[PDB]
Design an enzyme around this catalytic site. Sequence first.
Site, mmCIF file in Angstrom:
data_model
loop_
_atom_site.group_PDB
_atom_site.id
_atom_site.type_symbol
_atom_site.label_atom_id
_atom_site.label_comp_id
_atom_site.label_asym_id
_atom_site.label_seq_id
_atom_site.Cartn_x
_atom_site.Cartn_y
_atom_site.Cartn_z
ATOM 1 N N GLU A 116 -53.716 66.743 25.032
ATOM 2 C CA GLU A 116 -53.017 67.294 26.231
ATOM 3 C C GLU A 116 -52.429 65.808 26.719
ATOM 4 O OE1 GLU A 116 -53.932 66.505 30.267
ATOM 5 O OE2 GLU A 116 -54.961 68.528 30.466
ATOM 6 N N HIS A 117 -52.864 64.714 26.184
ATOM 7 C CA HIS A 117 -52.242 63.480 26.770
ATOM 8 C C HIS A 117 -51.011 62.827 25.794
ATOM 9 C CE1 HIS A 117 -55.180 60.982 29.265
ATOM 10 N NE2 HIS A 117 -55.571 62.345 29.309
ATOM 11 N N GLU A 146 -59.759 57.223 32.779
ATOM 12 C CA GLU A 146 -60.028 58.441 33.694
ATOM 13 C C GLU A 146 -61.390 59.049 33.692
ATOM 14 O OE1 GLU A 146 -57.134 61.171 31.744
ATOM 15 O OE2 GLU A 146 -55.603 60.624 32.926
#
Lengths: 443, 81
Positions: free
Chosen positions: A59-60, A136
């Site tokens: 997703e990154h 994160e």
Amino acid sequence: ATYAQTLQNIPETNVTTLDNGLRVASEESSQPTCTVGVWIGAGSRYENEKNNGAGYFVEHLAFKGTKKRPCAAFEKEVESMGAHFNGYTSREQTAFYIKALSKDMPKVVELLADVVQNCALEESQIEKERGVILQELKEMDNDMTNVTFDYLHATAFQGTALARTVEGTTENIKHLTRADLASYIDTHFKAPRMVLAAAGGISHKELVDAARQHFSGVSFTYKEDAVPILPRCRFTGSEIRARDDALPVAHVALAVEGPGWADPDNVVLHVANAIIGRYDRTFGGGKHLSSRLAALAVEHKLCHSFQTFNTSYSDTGLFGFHFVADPLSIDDMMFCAQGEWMRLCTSTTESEVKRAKNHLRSAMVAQLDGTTPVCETIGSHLLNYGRRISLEEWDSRISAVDARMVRDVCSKYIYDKCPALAAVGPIEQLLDYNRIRSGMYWI
Amino acid sequence: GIHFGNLARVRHIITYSLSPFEQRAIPNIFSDALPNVWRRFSSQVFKVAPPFLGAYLLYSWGTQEFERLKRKNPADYENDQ
């Protein structure tokens, strides 16, 4: 123009399937703007001990460029047309979607396909994101609410796949290989397990066409077009207690196993949750709120906030509540909370469900407030129910619910069950499991 | 009377527990329970037993000695006629 009529006059959702197995659905309106995206049936649940957090790692990179167009190029092109590119990855579902002018629906579809099929996975970009993801994880570690829900899954589904967090382990993030991500993408981002959904002012036939053009790469064998059924995740009545009296407030989440998407009872559980509702110190309503629990919270200052939830999944789910409170009001809050849950199974009223049904209707209507949310409904519905479910159907189902039905369904999933408990922060006042377990009967 | 909530200052400790219904009431009797009963017994026998053994002996003696002093001493009538 009555509520009923407006529900019937809503444009239908069109679905068509390509030969590769991919499904294309869309609801048409008259908006110059639109949202289109691909909802994939993938997530942490599909990962395992070695590749946990790969779907997140992906997703990154899903936005750092493809083969046909490197980073800068990919970005500039999307930015320069005023389109928004977002996405997310959960435990059982992933999604990459774009917001833009219907006038570009086709260019977008090409962009999406390029993202899900030809991610560059730049060896250097990977090491760069490895450090970002690690930052994160430390940021999210201060999100008590999310730390609490992760723990709730960690114990409620301990030993199974749903026990893992979406972001993954520190070890995994530190050792995932370019090959692993690659493998992930290939193993999961596959036509039959995806859905091209779009909403706004778009031609279903024009959508499906651009779809045929870019979403191709058909499969040869049978193992490539079959959607793998996941192994069942065992629910466990238990508790995990993370104590830190240094934290200002305490978070608590209690839950019982839920049915799973396909079960009709979910309509009732949602009506049930509607009766208990939710609350937070900024609800003007105050001591007059309909939700009994909310009223008590206000009167006795039981918490900063509380919320109910019915988190569904393919074969299971989590039905419970979550509250935040000062170290000294945890016991009373838990008491009143479990009390309301007993009232549900035992003494729900017609008036109660009447209100809760209305509240629930406007809740479902509110989840279709914009192109993105409607597009999200479609992706999810086909992916979970294998078909779109109209507001008119929901309303049809919601209308059939009555007090008796609420009591029976709630009694079924709640009464005398062993719950899953997660408590974080200054939780010394929260009584033991046994005492909580007893709050599960009589009420 | 009311104490839970103001007892101690604790940080960084996680605990895990299972419902009573998900587990055995009396598990691992032979692999764990008994082996431990033996451990416990063993580690206390030479602290406890000794003094009780001592008392037991003293009891035996004093009892026997008491009865012995009730018996006749033949040497009191050897030259009686």
